[PDB]
Amino acid sequence: MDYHEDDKRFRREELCREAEFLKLKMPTKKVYHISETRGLLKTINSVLQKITDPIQPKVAEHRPQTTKRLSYPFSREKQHLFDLTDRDSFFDSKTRSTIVYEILKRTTCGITSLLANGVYSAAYPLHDGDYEGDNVEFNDRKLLYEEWASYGVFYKYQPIDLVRKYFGEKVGLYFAWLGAYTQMLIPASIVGVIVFLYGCATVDENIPSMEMCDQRYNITMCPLCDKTCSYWKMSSACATARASHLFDNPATVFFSVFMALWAATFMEHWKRKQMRLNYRWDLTGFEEEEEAVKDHPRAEYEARVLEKSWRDRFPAYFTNLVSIIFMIAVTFAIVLGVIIYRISTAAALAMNPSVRSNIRVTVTATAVIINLVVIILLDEVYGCIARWLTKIEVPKTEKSFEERLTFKAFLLKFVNSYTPIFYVAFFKGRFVGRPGDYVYIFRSFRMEECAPGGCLMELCIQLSIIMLGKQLIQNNLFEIGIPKMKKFIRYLKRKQRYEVDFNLEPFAGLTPEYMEMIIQFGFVTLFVASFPLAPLFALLNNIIEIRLDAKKFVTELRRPVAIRAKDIGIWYNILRGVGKLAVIINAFVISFTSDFIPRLVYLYMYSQNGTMHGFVNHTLSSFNVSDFQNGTAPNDPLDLGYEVQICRYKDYREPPWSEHKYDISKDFWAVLAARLAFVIVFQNLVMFMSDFVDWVIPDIPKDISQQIHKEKVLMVELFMR
Amino acid sequence: MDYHEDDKRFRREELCREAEFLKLKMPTKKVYHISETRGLLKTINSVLQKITDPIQPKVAEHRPQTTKRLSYPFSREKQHLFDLTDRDSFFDSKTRSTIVYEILKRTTCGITSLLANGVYSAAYPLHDGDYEGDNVEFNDRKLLYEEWASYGVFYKYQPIDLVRKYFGEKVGLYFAWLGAYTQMLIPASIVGVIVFLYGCATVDENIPSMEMCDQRYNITMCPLCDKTCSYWKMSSACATARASHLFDNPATVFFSVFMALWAATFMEHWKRKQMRLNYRWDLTGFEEEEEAVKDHPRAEYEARVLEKSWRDRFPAYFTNLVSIIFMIAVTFAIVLGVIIYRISTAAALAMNPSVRSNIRVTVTATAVIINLVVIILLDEVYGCIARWLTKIEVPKTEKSFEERLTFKAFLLKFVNSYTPIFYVAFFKGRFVGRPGDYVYIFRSFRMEECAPGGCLMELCIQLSIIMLGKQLIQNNLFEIGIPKMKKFIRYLKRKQRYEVDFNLEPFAGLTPEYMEMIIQFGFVTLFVASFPLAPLFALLNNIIEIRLDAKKFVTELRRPVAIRAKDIGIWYNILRGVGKLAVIINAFVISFTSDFIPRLVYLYMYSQNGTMHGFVNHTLSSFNVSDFQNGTAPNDPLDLGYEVQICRYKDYREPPWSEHKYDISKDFWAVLAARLAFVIVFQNLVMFMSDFVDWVIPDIPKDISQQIHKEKVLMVELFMR
Numbered sequence A, B: 001m002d003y004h005e006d007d008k009r010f011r012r013e014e015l016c017r018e019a020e021f022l023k024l025k026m027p028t029k030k031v032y033h034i035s036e037t038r039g040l041l042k043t044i045n046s047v048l049q050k051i052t053d054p055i056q057p058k059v060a061e062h063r064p065q066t067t068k069r070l071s072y073p074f075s076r077e078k079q080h081l082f083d084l085t086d087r088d089s090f091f092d093s094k095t096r097s098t099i100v101y102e103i104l105k106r107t108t109c110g111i112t113s114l115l116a117n118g119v120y121s122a123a124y125p126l127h128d129g130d131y132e133g134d135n136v137e138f139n140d141r142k143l144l145y146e147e148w149a150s151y152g153v154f155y156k157y158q159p160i161d162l163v164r165k166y167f168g169e170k171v172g173l174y175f176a177w178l179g180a181y182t183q184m185l186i187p188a189s190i191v192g193v194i195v196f197l198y199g200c201a202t203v204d205e206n207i208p209s210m211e212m213c214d215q216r217y218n219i220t221m222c223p224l225c226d227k228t229c230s231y232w233k234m235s236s237a238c239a240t241a242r243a244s245h246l247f248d249n250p251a252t253v254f255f256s257v258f259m260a261l262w263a264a265t266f267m268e269h270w271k272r273k274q275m276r277l278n279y280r281w282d283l284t285g286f287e288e289e290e291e292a293v294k295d296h297p298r299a300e301y302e303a304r305v306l307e308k309s310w311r312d313r314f315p316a317y318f319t320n321l322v323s324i325i326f327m328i329a330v331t332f333a334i335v336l337g338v339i340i341y342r343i344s345t346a347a348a349l350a351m352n353p354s355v356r357s358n359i360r361v362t363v364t365a366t367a368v369i370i371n372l373v374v375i376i377l378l379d380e381v382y383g384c385i386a387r388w389l390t391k392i393e394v395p396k397t398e399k400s401f402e403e404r405l406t407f408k409a410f411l412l413k414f415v416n417s418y419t420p421i422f423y424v425a426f427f428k429g430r431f432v433g434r435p436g437d438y439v440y441i442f443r444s445f446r447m448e449e450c451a452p453g454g455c456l457m458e459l460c461i462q463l464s465i466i467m468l469g470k471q472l473i474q475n476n477l478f479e480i481g482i483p484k485m486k487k488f489i490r491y492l493k494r495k496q497r498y499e500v501d502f503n504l505e506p507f508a509g510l511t512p513e514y515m516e517m518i519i520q521f522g523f524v525t526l527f528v529a530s531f532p533l534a535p536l537f538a539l540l541n542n543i544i545e546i547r548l549d550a551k552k553f554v555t556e557l558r559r560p561v562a563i564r565a566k567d568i569g570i571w572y573n574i575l576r577g578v579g580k581l582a583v584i585i586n587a588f589v590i591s592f593t594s595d596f597i598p599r600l601v602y603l604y605m606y607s608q609n610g611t612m613h614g615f616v617n618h619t620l621s622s623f624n625v626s627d628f629q630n631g632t633a634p635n636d637p638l639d640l641g642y643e644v645q646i647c648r649y650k651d652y653r654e655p656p657w658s659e660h661k662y663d664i665s666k667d668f669w670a671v672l673a674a675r676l677a678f679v680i681v682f683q684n685l686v687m688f689m690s691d692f693v694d695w696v697i698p699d700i701p702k703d704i705s706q707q708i709h710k711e712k713v714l715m716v717e718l719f720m721r
């Protein structure tokens, strides 16, 4: 109701008696530090905490606690450790909670140790009040709800200063990074939409697509499966080629280069914005060299080692390596099983009406749904096992534990999210053989063939499904519904502020949010040469996500402790690494799965006339149907208006009427050399461009540096006077 | 003789009267700062300078001047700004000279401005005394001469602390970097010698070299020139192939990878050593943001702009770009002229005894000598023009001027030093055509053909000549003789210390020394896949160079002002960039000029038997001598024991008895694809390995950080007590 209580100790109301004694001595050991009050609740009982005014300077002066001073050159209050202040209430409640948390966790007895032991089942600060109500006291929580956490203010700049003041520099840094990411995604989305519009405009005049779509010509392709399917006409995939043209053209290559430059520019812009926010909030980077607080399990391990009698973690490290390798192998095996799923389901379904008319979408849709559900469960399981792996290695400090767990979880999430996309982009229909000599996995299954029109369309469909159904629909819906579902379950199985805050969901951390954003960034950067509009989908998802996260923080979760951070941490390194890998991934996508290199090679060496006419005939090689290997020919030749004597396919192999029939032709080697040369040139040039963009743009803006120098001069002048 | 004089103003003894007045007011404006004495010399007159004891704390306290304090935990005197001291003589004479230089250059009137105007023709501090003599006072100069500057102490560690104390942190940092470079080059030299020994041992069992050396077989090669030369037997270049085998093999590829890793490790080791030296000497990185001293020409330009009425340097920038492009074009044109030199000289010489028996060495030796002399003169001219280019742009501060001049000079020196080597390695005999269709430069000259045995041997010979005759013999001899020559010229056209120091050569700077070392590093790293023993030659040159530079500093040059530096500066960035480019250069050398890829391709696709037999026949293509283009056949067919009907050559072209005779074969495209794939794989893997080496090794050693933390704790404890 009405008080100034600064923290909330919560314990299970009642060996049971032995555990009760532990919580009777900790408050006694902090009686002279913090004055508490006991609340005899009705359900589980709860304990209040209060910090007195004199204790504030004693603990606020233990470490440098900058506070805004009186002088304000250029309307900027000076931040000084301890110069002069008054009114005995200038501390923000977040700062009071942070000081109280320092007092609790610095005790010898530690709040973390007893929380782990289970004597205390909860501990949190309180919100300033209710975010919604009738004529409420006009707290900062309601201000954030109305001004920042509403879905109707999705277009306006977020009050980042108020967010940092209420929740701390950590959540504030996360939201500032999210806003900068969305703002940078805006122009990239515009350019991608322009590229897509250019492709749509040019699709009608595309010579290869027109040649593929010509129904006057009769081009018969070999079957994509042994006996389930038969010969198909090249014109049957006219829509696929026209759709594909919108995703591979010179505009797409230009957009890939533009997105590499955009990633570099976004990195530089985030560096500058982070420096600006540090100058605005706090620039005291001096901290203990991991000597502030030590991990209690680490302390117990050290005590055990000393009682018995670094580098003793080797069995843990080997276990971590083995577990990670096993996880990656399991993910690859699940991908292989999904591959085997599509082959068996397609063959069985065709043997059965409407089922044989929708074999493509029915097999692909069910496979996609199965993969998405399986990898959701895999993400949960791998997060838990990464928790365990980081626990067993026993990091010395909490910061190292968070660092290593974040690295492991990001690696596992990267593998699970990008394995099927990498497979479809590179290795889907590449390792098969000629129609007379196929390759079978487990000598029972023909592995995989690209859909009529190439595997680029499949990659585009997969990317669209992943970034719309999963990242935009399923993920956000799960985020909204999981806290509500758990609250409803808890309910199934006036009021004081501490009680209502206790009913709120505990804060989990910024790791899942950063993980989602980094995965989306990887989607935007790694796969953009073959798929424009990825920045547009990311922009829409981020527009929803800013308000979703703000609402979750304001209304659902408990108030975090609001510890200090000046950097996003390992996430910047992860972003830089993903951006660096995006250059190689984009180069390989353009060279091997884009079909752009073969068109250039044909135009500049085999065109003769100098145009693109005859490219489809050039890329298609003839095969004699009589050379099928006794059980691979179509079970029922359709015989639409003829009998197939020679079926066409695209492998760059010499014709049956040659001495070296079905062997790799010179055109294959020339096109492969062109692909490799383009990969080399693209990678080197894009890396040089990114390095140039990094080098030209200064890390710290000159204005911030000059303002810092002027502030230091003024502060030293005041100090000596 | 005997005094404590701390600086030496020197002026031309006598508008002349107007200039004399300028030097009469500067000492008056510093009478209260520095007490001078006038020396009425006999030749040109000279002025002494002295700084009093009270002025030392006034100027030493203007900026943080750390001095070793009394406390010494772990035998380490504490470095503090101003805590307590005594004896009134604890300042080193180098520190006294630095303080005096600060006093002189901070005056408004500035010593730099009047030195530029010409009123003062010289200004320097004095050496502690004579480095050699009979029962001399045992100064630090003689200690450095005996202990560090002698050629007989080439094997011992240099007294880097004494060098830094006498000459300052700048020369000390240069010499520490040189010593670390030599120490790192030692193991690399050992591994390279081992690789060379492996090649020498294996050369007898090399199947391709044995096949080339077989005199039983009769393989006739097409002439390498139109009419000057005739058909030659493949066995005539047996020595060339055997010598080449020592420079291209799996050991050479392993050594290229090892040298990439070694460059990364050397960068990390230098970073750690630099941090250690900073901790030992000075860690006060706080300095003015280019606000300490402004360039006098920049001030004059700003005053002119303000009187008339950033980004006004655009005509200067355009001039700089045009001049740099013109310089690079001139260097490339000189390379082209050297190319045209060899063609014309070879043809003319053969038309003439002994001349026709030594056409190869005579043409190549004279061409190499001409190129070396021309590029020496080019280096001098380009250094002067880079001086002018940096002057015209008017850098705001001296540090920016030095930075930009160093960048321009390094770029020009890189171009001049590496243009011929790059040409010989990549573009020498690559752009010629088939024997029936050659390509002529200016339609008068057949451009260039690789010597019998490949262009790898020519590259190895060029590298050996460059790193032995030029970098080791010519460069060191010129360094030793130029100061002696100038001193002898000055002489042709008891004594006080200032006079003898005046006779000494003025200090030029560390830029030429760093430039030589960086060029040698580029030689060691960029071209090492095709040439082992490069680290060995670099190690020998550095062993000579350490003592040569020490002797030059101790005995020849005047004592530098000994300004402070904590980093080598732009040279670290240049080294990192050269190392990064070395990966790509090594990959291209291995793939295109090493002949390693074709051997693998033949062994794994065309070998059949699985061995290397028949590789030489595979790489050689037949040509019908009747297809010469009417003036390209040999003028005099030698007819040793037969008449040539078909001459062989290596171009991967189909034989005359085929329908597509002389066209590019499938083997050419396959080998090109293999080369490009190897380039991609090598570049990516080596970049990842270098990044891993950088990431694993911490930049600052933990010992230095913990010692700094302990020192800070002790200092704060003493400060509060």
Ligand SMILES: N#Cc1c(C(F)(F)F)cc(O)n2c1nc1ccccc12
Pocket: A335, A338, A339, A364, A368, A371, A420, A421, A423, A424, A428, A457, A458, A459, A460, A461, A462, A463, A465
């Ligand atoms: N989404 C999606 C997928 C699509 C398509 F985009 F067209 F719908 C096609 C496809 O072959 N695969 C997809 N996911 C896969 C996972 C493992 C193996 C193959 C996989």
Ligand SMILES: N#Cc1c(C(F)(F)F)cc(O)n2c1nc1ccccc12
Pocket: B335, B338, B339, B364, B368, B371, B420, B421, B423, B424, B428, B457, B458, B459, B460, B461, B462, B463, B465
């Ligand atoms: N040194 C050296 C050179 C050698 C060799 F090593 F064999 F001696 C061979 C060679 O063709 N060239 C050399 N320098 C060149 C500069 C420009 C053009 C060609 C050049």
Ligand SMILES: [Ca+2]
Pocket: A471, A475, A476, A479, A516, A545
């Ligand atoms: Ca989401």
Ligand SMILES: [Ca+2]
Pocket: A479, A512, A513, A516, A545, A549
């Ligand atoms: Ca989220």
Ligand SMILES: [Ca+2]
Pocket: A268, A694, A695, A696, A697, A698, A699
């Ligand atoms: Ca930068």
Ligand SMILES: [Ca+2]
Pocket: B471, B475, B476, B479, B516, B545
């Ligand atoms: Ca030298």
Ligand SMILES: [Ca+2]
Pocket: B479, B512, B513, B516, B545, B549
């Ligand atoms: Ca030198």
Ligand SMILES: [Ca+2]
Pocket: B268, B694, B695, B696, B697, B698, B699
């Ligand atoms: Ca490092």
